[PDB]
Amino acid sequence: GLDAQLTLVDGSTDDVRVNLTLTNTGDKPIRLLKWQLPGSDDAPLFLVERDGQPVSYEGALIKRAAPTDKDFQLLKAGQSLTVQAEVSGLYDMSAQGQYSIRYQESNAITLWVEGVNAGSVSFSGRCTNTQKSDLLTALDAASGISNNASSYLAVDGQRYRSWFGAYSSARWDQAETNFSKIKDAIDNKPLTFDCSCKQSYFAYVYPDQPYKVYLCKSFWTAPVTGSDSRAGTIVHQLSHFNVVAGTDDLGYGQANARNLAKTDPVKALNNADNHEYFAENTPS
């Protein structure tokens, strides 16, 4: 027969990693569908319950052809295979509470889940409970710098001059209106964060697909606040949506933004990093 043993992996993050050991206890080799083993392809391979109630699978479903030889993993007589999966990225484990997880069938393992923490926030692209929690934390920080930016623009200034260049009331109203909409998106709109991107840069968006922001490797290496920070990256990204500010990416980096501000204030007003650096205001 085929036995499935599941063990929780102990770790210091909020992720939920499990080790699954499949063992062929019989005397003849058996063939296992690779699709039915944890992997790079989403599959609903677990029963996950919070407090006795199943929670949702959040991954994709895939149409595949009938399997051929290529699609099987062979397990010899007596032989075991162990694979590790992170479960929080694939099921709805966002709410605090006592969870069980069973492969499905294995024994159930159980654990406590801390809880990741108008407007709403959704996730896709296998964000783990760590990433979800970090993203919400980064959003609260973005809210802080975006509120600050708005308050500044409403009062009456080197901060403005730095990022947006020579004063004109039309450009200053334009900047204030852009920050007003960014603050409204953070405060009141349905945001989506996606964690599937493995690229070396910070994030990307489609300006016609509000309000979904795709984080990449540099987001995770960035500090939560400060220059080129997780908070500022969310301000940058939001500013691109057609329904927010419609900014472009005309240049990257503080040095470039200060140049654009000096040489062509209209382009600076249309640049995402310029908006980011105005809100990050680091150094102050």
Which parts of this chain interact with Zn ion (CB under 5 A)?
61, 63, 249, 272
Which residues are within 8 A (CB) of 167 and not within 5 positions of it... i.e. 6 or more apart? 160, 161
Does 69 participate in binding its own copies (rule CB under 8 A)? no
Pick from 66, 118, 155, 170 the residue near its own copies by CB under 8 A: 66
CA distance 212 to 202: 14
Confirm or reject binding of residue 70 to Cl ion (CB under 5 A): no
DSSP letter (8 states) at residue 97: E
> Which CB sits closer to Zn ion, 89 or 232?
232
**Residue 65 binds Cl ion, judged by CB under 5 A:** no
Q: Residue 92 burial by CB count (10 A; 0-12/13-18/19+): exposed, middle or buried? A: middle
- Say if residues 86 and 128 touch (Cβ distance below 8 Å): yes
Q: Which of the stretches 63-71, 105-113, 139-147, 182-190 binds its own copies when contact is defined by CB under 8 A?
A: 63-71
CB of 257 to its own copies, least distance (A): 10
Between CA 157 and CA 199 the distance in angstroms is 37
Task: Classify 176 in phi/psi space as left (phi over 0), alpha (psi -120 to 50) or beta.
Answer: alpha
Element (H, E) at 179: helix 169-188
Segment 133 to 192, residues that bind its own copies, using CB under 8 A: none
Looking at residue 34, the DSSP 8-state letter turns out to be G
The kind and range of the H/E element at 149 are: helix 129-154
Bridge partners, 82 (sequence order): 21
| C-beta of 14 vs 58, nearer to Zn ion | 58
One character per residue 235-274, x = contact with its own copies (rule: CB under 8 A): -xx--x-------xx--xxxxx---------------xx-
Rounded Cα distance, 45 and 83, in Å:
13
Among 1, 53, 63, 156, binds Cl ion (CB under 5 A): 63
**Could you give the string, one character per residue 175-214, with x where binding to Cl ion holds by CB under 5 A and - elsewhere?**
-----------------------------x----------
Binding site for its own copies (CB under 8 A): 41-42, 44, 56, 58-67, 124, 199, 201-209, 214, 218, 228, 233, 236-237, 240, 248-249, 252-256, 272-273
Binding site for Cl ion (CB under 5 A): 61, 63, 204, 237
Residues tagged in the binding site annotation: 236, 240, 249
Residues tagged in the binding site annotation for Zn(2+): 236, 240, 249
